[PDB]
């Protein structure tokens, strides 16, 4: 409905990446999904997500959620609620958000466009 960015948890990306907040259950839009190079192991999916203010590509899906991508329930433009996630910090200082539980609130086909004009998060 009208004011589409009002459907997303504006400010959640900054909160996750800076405050270390893990209790929140933010609503985010998937902008893009791409497989990461793996080899002899299940694929892993990396996501460019939006909270309506920022985009951030430092999300990965827990492999238990792979069927959501492979059966096309989780795809570009869908709106999702993150019910459980963890944050990992790499040796170089970058942070990665591993999505453990999520719910698709609106399918990609029911949304159909990138919501708002989010700008890349500066980590
Ligand atoms: O090839 C490539 O092109 C490639 C590769 C990677 C990549 C980078 C980091 C890792 C991590 S953070 N290694 C530790 C880890 C992995 C899974 C877990 C876990 C906890 C529960 C589960 C589960 O249930 O599945 O998995 C925990 C620690 C992995 C790949 N990336 C990459 C680079 C930069 C960013 Cl910002 C991102 Cl998001 C990905 N690109």
UniProtKB/Swiss-Prot annotation:
The modification N-acetylmethionine is found at residue 4. Changing residue 44 to E: Loss of HELB-binding. There is a cross-link at residues 25, 91 (Glycyl lysine isopeptide (Lys-Gly) (interchain with G-Cter in ubiquitin)). It is found in: Nucleus; Nucleus, PML body. DNA damage-induced 'Lys-63'-linked polyubiquitination by PRPF19 mediates ATRIP recruitment to the RPA complex at sites of DNA damage and activation of ATR. Ubiquitinated by RFWD3 at stalled replication forks in response to DNA damage: ubiquitination by RFWD3 does not lead to degradation by the proteasome and promotes removal of the RPA complex from stalled replication forks, promoting homologous recombination. It is linked to Pulmonary fibrosis, and/or bone marrow failure syndrome, telomere-related, 6: An autosomal dominant disease associated with shortened telomeres. Pulmonary fibrosis is the most common manifestation. Other manifestations include aplastic anemia due to bone marrow failure, hepatic fibrosis, and increased cancer risk, particularly myelodysplastic syndrome and acute myeloid leukemia. Phenotype, age at onset, and severity are determined by telomere length. Component of the canonical replication protein A complex (RPA), a heterotrimer composed of RPA1, RPA2 and RPA3. Also a component of the aRPA, the alternative replication protein A complex, a trimeric complex similar to the replication protein A complex/RPA but where RPA1 and RPA3 are associated with RPA4 instead of RPA2. The DNA-binding activity may reside exclusively on the RPA1 subunit. Interacts with PRPF19; the PRP19-CDC5L complex is recruited to the sites of DNA repair where it ubiquitinates the replication protein A complex (RPA). Interacts with RIPK1. Belongs to the replication factor A protein 1 family. As part of the heterotrimeric replication protein A complex (RPA/RP-A), binds and stabilizes single-stranded DNA intermediates that form during DNA replication or upon DNA stress. It prevents their reannealing and in parallel, recruits and activates different proteins and complexes involved in DNA metabolism. Thereby, it plays an essential role both in DNA replication and the cellular response to DNA damage. In the cellular response to DNA damage, the RPA complex controls DNA repair and DNA damage checkpoint activation. This is Replication protein A 70 kDa DNA-binding subunit. It comes from Homo sapiens (Human). The lineage of its organism: Eukaryota, Metazoa, Chordata, Craniata, Vertebrata.
